[PDB]
Amino acid sequence: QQLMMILNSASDQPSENLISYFNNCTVNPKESILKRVKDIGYIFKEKFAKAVGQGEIGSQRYKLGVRLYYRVMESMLKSEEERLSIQNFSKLLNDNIFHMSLLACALEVVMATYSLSFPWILNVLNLKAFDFYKVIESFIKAEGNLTREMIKHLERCEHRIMESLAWLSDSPLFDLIKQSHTAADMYLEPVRKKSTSLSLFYKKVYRLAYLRLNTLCERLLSEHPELEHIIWTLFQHTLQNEYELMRDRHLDQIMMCSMYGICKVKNIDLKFKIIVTAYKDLPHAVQETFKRVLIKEEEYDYIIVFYNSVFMQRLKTNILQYASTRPPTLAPIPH
């Protein structure tokens, strides 16, 4: 409530100190930014009411998002003023996706505060999950007054993107994989040089996925504490080189298939039900991630089907190496 107070007692328009930043720009963004806000209010209020029904509360919801947005932007620009050139500073304040993403993050903070949850706001504004992800950490770092709970909600939005949404078909993420650390750096990347967006994203994916396997292996593989490290390499080599297997799927599905897979090739019998059972106890686990996965185009099925009919058909050649006289070398633990 400490933040919602300044938002409820603050102005509807950009501050004088923020107007300075606008005045220090080669191309001045003042008019592009506000018209952008005005236009977007309309798509937000329409799509809002068409979800709760009739009575218009959305206008008040949007106006607080707009106040948070202008506040967070000012805070963000104050550090980017030393980091960015005169020309990068202006390329940023004129970049639309950066702005959409920032405003979307403001709007989600209020929506979630007033518990249509994420990822509603992305589709409302037609914003790709991978673009929105680029703003979150710097958004947190730029709003000192976020509640513990608000921070925690945003980090959960970040993690849903990394686990599934950025892997949806049409995600620019795949463009970036084929082509081959702040929000402003990541939005200033030119469309077409090693990409900072993909590299940070992957450094964080690996750290997240591994935290989830490590919990899952301590409970179920106390008898094979050496197997944990062997499983991560299959998981990591999968994500790096066989990335297509995540298209429209969930990080946790590739995890579970790997730990079952290695224990099969090591002649360690542990059936899928014993792990799918252990997986549910994870904080935000949901049973459909293992109850319905993709087998064939526009087809859904149980998880063991995916393991037998999708996972091995690409990776059978790579897995048997794990038991030969020449087993593949183990992957570095993400720091």
Residue numbers in the entry: 383 to 437, 440 to 499, 512 to 576, 600 to 611, 642 to 784
Sentences from the paper on this structure:
The retinoblastoma tumor suppressor (Rb) is a multifunctional protein that primarily regulates the cell cycle but also has roles in cellular differentiation, DNA damage response, and apoptosis. Essential functions of Rb occur through its pocket domain, which is necessary for regulating binding interactions with E2F transcription factors and transcription repressors that bind via an LxCxE motif. The pocket domain is the most highly conserved region of the multidomain protein, as well as the most frequent site of mutations. Protein X-ray crystallography of four missense variants reveals how mutations destabilize the protein fold and inhibit E2FTD or LxCxE binding.
For a structural example of E7LxCxE inhibition, S751Y was crystallized. This variant weakens both E2F1TD and E7LxCxE binding relative to WT but causes the greatest reduction to E7LxCxE binding of all 75 missense variants tested here. The biggest reduction in E7LxCxE binding occurs for S751Y, which weakens the RbP–E7LxCxE binding interaction relative to WT by approximately 26-fold at 25 °C and 35-fold at 37 °C. The structure of S751Y reveals that the tyrosine sidechain of the mutant sits within a hydrophobic-binding pocket used for LxCxE binding. Specifically, the tyrosine sits in a position to compete for the binding of a conserved I or L, which constitutes a significant part of the LxCxEx(I/L)-binding epitope. Even though the variant tyrosine creates a snug fit into the pocket used for I/L binding, this variant is not stabilizing; instead, it causes a large destabilizing effect (ΔTm = −5.4 ± 0.5 °C). In the structure of WT Rb-E7LxCxE, the S751 sidechain helps to stabilize the N-terminus of an alpha helix through an ST motif–stabilizing H-bond to the amide at i+3. Loss of this known helix-stabilizing motif may be responsible for the large thermostability decrease seen for S751Y.
